[PDB]
Amino acid sequence: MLTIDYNSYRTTTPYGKRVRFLVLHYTALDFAASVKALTTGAASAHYLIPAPHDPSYKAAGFKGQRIFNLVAEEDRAWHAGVSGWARRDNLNDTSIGIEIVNLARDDDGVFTFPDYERSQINALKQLAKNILQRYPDMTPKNVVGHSDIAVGRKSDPGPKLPWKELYEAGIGAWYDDATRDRYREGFERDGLPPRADLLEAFRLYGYALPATVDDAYFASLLRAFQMHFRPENYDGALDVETAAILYALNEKYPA
């Protein structure tokens, strides 16, 4: 038999950690229904931020707030299903997912997104910061939401999610307004870029686009982009702000 040599030679520059993205979700259930399904159901996530004002949560004996780890980061949780971002897929492998309890709703298929709880958010930024500091390849655009990786079969973490706040806190990507505007103007005057340029520019940001984009799809896409970066409205409707935002990110957060 033969024991392994962990001390003689260690690689330094040419290597990274496996995890790249941090993805965000709303459970869509009350806590108990959420621990159950993320611990024994058919999915899971690495971390779970409860909504402290949840009867089930308090019932379970929690004063809260807490953050719960359901799967250590080393391992692979199931939250991202069929995915894609930044030229990848099956992001379950390569990401860390966070689930926050928030009973957003699909009602065939009108939607309803409750505001999050503050503590819940202060927790989140706290956690999310702890991750980012530990994965160096988790650049700002890689802090994403299911909706972005799973367009438009998913819509968490939903437009009630204070990204910009998180940006402000160092977490995830956001545009310099100046640069946004510079595009808005340019677009209003010089008109708008062909779909071609757009899709592509959407791709570059990260979005996993199919070969061929029905406007039907497009909607889903814009929608998603919007609930993230322009949640003031997320009608799948090609705007100039919306489009300006895009290039404003692609300017600041480029290849």
Partner: peptide
């Protein structure tokens, strides 16, 4: 949330 949701393997693949």
């Amino acid at each position: 949330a949701x393997k693949x």
